[PDB]
Amino acid sequence: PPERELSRLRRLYQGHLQEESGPPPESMP
Amino acid sequence: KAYRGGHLTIRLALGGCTNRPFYRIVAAHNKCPRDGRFVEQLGSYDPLPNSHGEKLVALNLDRIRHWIGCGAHLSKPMEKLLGLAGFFPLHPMMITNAERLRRKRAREVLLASQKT
């Protein structure tokens, strides 16, 4: 997403948040 | 039976013995139980891998275009199943847990890295 809406959810849940990564990878062995 | 504001749902049903699941999709009322009576019968879904490993599904997709054609609500696991085949597009929660396990295998590529 564009980074302003990514922060828009961060405006809502400031007491309940986890951290994350960006893309999921391509494959896994 | 007269059900106050009932709609029609295409649900799964249990018909196997203990530790042997066997699903079977049915067109029924919303508030009749899982094992209970249906309106009309549709194909079976076999969740157990048979000899030489297949997980079998039957779908008479002529009458589900008569029943979802007549406005039937769906069940979430069958909602995934037509996306796992291609009658519907794939469900978002099947996409996420595909990416989640990938991201749960993307924490495996640092647990494999920090030992060797």
Partner: protein, 201 residues
Amino acid sequence: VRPRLIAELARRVRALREQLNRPRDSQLYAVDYETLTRPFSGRRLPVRAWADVRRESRLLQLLGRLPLFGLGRLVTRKSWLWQHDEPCYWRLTRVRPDYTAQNLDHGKAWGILTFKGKTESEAREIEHVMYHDWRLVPKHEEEAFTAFTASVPYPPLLRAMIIAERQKNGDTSTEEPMLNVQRIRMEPWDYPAKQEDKGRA
């Protein structure tokens, strides 16, 4: 046939007691601000909506201090600020405020919706009238606050039917069948719905 002389007369006496000694909004839309429950119901509000009741303000406790109860004024929901910078709001045409309520709020009203700039006629009732997610637009800076400016392919097995029906019926027609979006409307989950489709418990 054995007629139910009791179970017939027992139905109006519920219909004349859900009509006579019904409690109004004033005794079920107050909120304890110290335990976060409700009077007469006890059922606590979810922890996602705690600050909006506790720290913000309602609609008609903001609208309890205006001439003609805001005969044409503008009102905005708290969420509508944080989700859409586009101007989403109501107008007003009528109010039916409560009278038992000390420090007046909780009443009834209806008016004209404009969703992110898209206006609509056919004045209907406001949603979330008892809810505490409300802010007022002041008439200094009132004009620039309201300032506003295809088809999908088939999933593959249903795609596999139509191409086979073409090969059955006579034409090759390697045109891809394209079902539309342009009749199906996409109103969001934040769209407030009509009120008298709901009933007050």
